Amino acid sequence: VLSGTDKTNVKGIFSKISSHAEEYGAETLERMFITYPQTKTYFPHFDLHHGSAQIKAHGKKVANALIEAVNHIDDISGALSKLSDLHAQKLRVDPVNFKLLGQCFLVVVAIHHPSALTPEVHASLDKFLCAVGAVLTAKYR
């Protein structure tokens, strides 16, 4: 699980965002779509051109979900459980895709906050993203 040091590490770097949910979420997805084009299959209905309004709107929701999880880090399930239905039951997102997006979020962090993404904070952030991924794919288990 996440240690008290992990929870502290995550909240710290999320404060460092922190008014940057919209742009970081959007950047995360854009990176995901160009780096891993196979993930575009889940968004046939979006205009997938860079900077499209739908991606901006969607990235905002993705970031806010992550912030809500940082806020309720003691029970991540409790707070993002509604999303598993959507991702796993409705959308049938392949579990491999959660790592990809995680990867892109970490990159977006590294780009903007390179000194704050210390190996220890990177490890704690990894733990956090994987636990989020676990909650979203929970209807698979």
Binding site: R31, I34, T35, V107, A110, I111, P114, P119, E120, A123
Partner: protein, 146 residues
Amino acid sequence: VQWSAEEKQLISGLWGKVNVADCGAEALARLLIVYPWTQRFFASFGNLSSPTAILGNPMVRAHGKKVLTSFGDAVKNLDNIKNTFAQLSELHCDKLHVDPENFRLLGDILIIVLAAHFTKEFTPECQAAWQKLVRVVAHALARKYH
């Protein structure tokens, strides 16, 4: 694998700027901290007992440079990667028995380290080309399993 002119330019462009030694040390050390099981292949390196120990470790630091140098060999011959890594595939596969999944976690870490070093210069197209690179390298490094 096919490399477009733009991919080739993005790869060689960034590579000229890469601190092989520090980026190398950083990537390996991150691997061992973020994915603690990989420490098992490095028992010869001594103290892997804390993040600080791992970051401080001279053999970790030195091995990192040569792993990144070897990524550089891929950059340097993009069309001959499978040959360049053949002897290394045997070592990793036959001698060391490293699950190829871990080649993938190393590539991902290298992306994150390259992101931190290059900041906004590490554009989406750049992340995409470099990700392909580490993917092509993992695949050539795994071919002795197949």
